[model samples]
Target chain A: GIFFPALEQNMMGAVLINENDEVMFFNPAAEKLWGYKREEVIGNNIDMLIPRDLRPAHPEYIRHNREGGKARVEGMSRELQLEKKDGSKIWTRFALSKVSAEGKVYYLALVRD
Target chain B: GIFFPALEQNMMGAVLINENDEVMFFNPAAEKLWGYKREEVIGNNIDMLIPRDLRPAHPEYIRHNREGGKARVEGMSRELQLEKKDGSKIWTRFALSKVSAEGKVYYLALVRD
Candidate 1:
């Protein structure tokens, strides 16, 4: 897998989840947004970033709505609620996209506070 | 060069410039903020995004000052004023990072409104 140092150091909170919703990459800004360290989120289920109870019922789940998750094109201005590591909640803007790199599929979610 | 579909569709405005200060990638969010189409900025000088007068003296120039632009360790919460395509001026938060992919160095600047 390629390393995304740029994304890792970017200003927007970014999470790269593999097809199975496992966090493949978590950037510094993402750590600040969710109060979770990069080491804590990578290789972990993205569900850990959402509210404990809403994990099952949340359609987005940091996952896309459509089977391919291409329902929205580019980035639509959308505000979403997310849970932090300390069990605190905050509102954030989100943009979800399906990406293919080197023949592998990954879900990229960009979050803004 | 490898493609960054994830960054291309991200919520934060992103511009990837080469060591020579040429714009390599311009994402959708950046396009909206600068009012320039992706094609208009890519391959052009990144200075086009700044006010014309500040090109030489801006200090940042999206280029690092320590001869490598590593002065800032990570994404710092810094706000900067920028110029838009319509000659409009807006304040934006910025984070500058130097990245290496495939042995080539690129400067990645993340902008937020």
Candidate 2:
């Protein structure tokens, strides 16, 4: 339960995903970036924003990030995009990471070309 | 594949936590706000900055956010600090949220005076 009020109206495409991977909040910048309205995205899983080809088959892939989670298995030729816990790097359409508070972990990221 | 180059060193106390809930990146602004050098905090769980009294008894509490979670029972008199998916407000030191791309999730947050 932590937030910066400045994000409420920033030009950047901001998203707030809850513990269940639900889109608790998606700002206007996201709307323009993804071509989806906030109402259509909020309350939905973060995967919906991604194309089916790259979307995880189940939430387990996301959970893998938890205990014993490492070594991304996404089938794509990787390049310098996002970094991993082990000093390794992977390719990503946008960078995503976690920030925790009061035992709750929320995801943070940006959208772009 | 996507990122706003500007956040690399902004005045805001920006933190980048990986899926393991480890602080992957804590910028200069964060060093000033948290009073901890990046060398000391990075790669540590997000809990290190929080007071122990409120820290989770176990990482499971954090994992609970992943599935069949909710119903925070922390022993504290909460107030209007953060918002939940149900539109309820709870007490928090700051706000944390997620942005996603290519199925990977990340966290975004800031510190305040």
Candidate 3:
């Protein structure tokens, strides 16, 4: 309740995804960063924010983690690039984290420009 | 809601505060970073996480922003130090955002160690 409201206005980009890799939450800064509104991005595959060259391998990367394999990004901060709705890219330093609820796994990423 | 459950498990420290500077939400990682349980932090003044030497000036800093003044942290990321429940400190990089809902203002911060 209170958390979401504050999160929506946060200047940093915050993205949350469920086990299925579906977008579950997209904050306002994230929307601006990716050039998509919350309604447009929510429920969509997170890959929509990945550059086309990396999209094909994105699922495999996620699957590897989903299969109980070690994560390359979880708990780590890295500088990377993401695609915007206009097919342009923006650079960011992001950190990844995981959460489990109701027996389902979820992932959260906090990105800073 | 789904957002809260996912956030609870996020590895990054997440915190939300209302206009009164009272903590409204604190995630697991925040608890670990600050050495305080969520129950101990929620409803408490956020000044508890500030170093004693910095505490006295913290409210003035917040008030400066609360009066429709420019914020030093909002929409910005910086490396800073915060106090732990044990009186120790940890360094981190944090970004803050704001949200206005129901005629109330709130702030959200995402911290990475």
Candidate 4:
């Protein structure tokens, strides 16, 4: 799970994670959006938020990112089904980015639901 | 408060409230959107979710409803800031509808953030 800094919503937070699934950061908007307390989710595995059904593809996504693939969420602006803390679902539109920070490859995902 | 039954998001629940600020119905999508469990929010005051800033306008809105005004959130497709349970804000696009049932006026609100 990556949050984009640029697409920051005053009411939303953005986040980004490295290939290792370590979180880079999450904006305040994200904190409220996901009902996560700030600082609690950071440095945790991005996989923690993925629904069970989508868990399988997550590893492949990481692999793809490690292979230097450039998958993005911006152009897509697509609708997706996601799991909430209550095991309920939501539809969200979001964008993604791939970047290298501190010489380590990272993936940024800016999402809204 | 209102949830649109038509625009069912696979990942979201929807809700709508009447002019008296009383809960009407909540779709599964709306249920997931605001983190309120089903049955918990129904029959509750719609004001429970409104931010402090908007509280004053709400009574006026209810008064307007008693006077037969039509305020809609669709077509305009605008964004507004909202407060969340975490004491944070969110930007959402919403629509409102005024309906008459059993000779009592009701308002329907469809929203996305």
Best-fitting candidate, measured by DockQ?
3
The segments of candidate 3 whose C-alpha lies over 4 angstroms from its true place after superposition are: A69-76, B69-76
Candidate 1 lDDT by residue in tens digits, B34-58: 9999999878876787777687775
After TM-score superposition, the amount by which residue B66's alpha carbon in candidate 2 deviates from its true location, in angstroms, is 42
Candidate 2 vs. true structure, TM-score:
0.41
TM-score to native of every candidate shown: 0.67, 0.41, 0.86, 0.44
- Ranking by TM-score, best first? 3, 1, 4, 2
In Å, residue A13's CA in model 4 sits off its true spot by 3.0
Write one digit per residue (lDDT tens) for candidate 1, span A2-110.
2366776555678888767789878888989999888788898877876788778664633454355453445345677788888889998776666666666676876
The residue-by-residue lDDT of candidate 2 on A4-104, one tens digit each, is 32354443467767778888778876776666789998899877765554465546656766443332223222222433223343344344555453456
Quality of candidate 2's docking, in CAPRI categories?
incorrect
lDDT of 3 by residue, A1-113 (tens): 76666556667688888889999889877888889999998899988867899889888877777777443346336778878888888788877766666667777777777
Two-chain DockQ for each candidate model = 0.33, 0.03, 0.65, 0.02
Error of 1 at A75 (Å): 9.6
User: What is each model's TM-score for chain A?
Assistant: 0.78, 0.66, 0.87, 0.76
The runs of at least 3 residues in candidate 2 whose Cα sits more than 4 Å from the true structure, single-residue gaps closed, are: A1-3, A68-93, B1-113
Clashing pairs in 1: B64-B69
lDDT, model 2, position B46: 78
lDDT of 3: 0.76
Deviation in angstroms for B88 in model 4?
Answer: 39
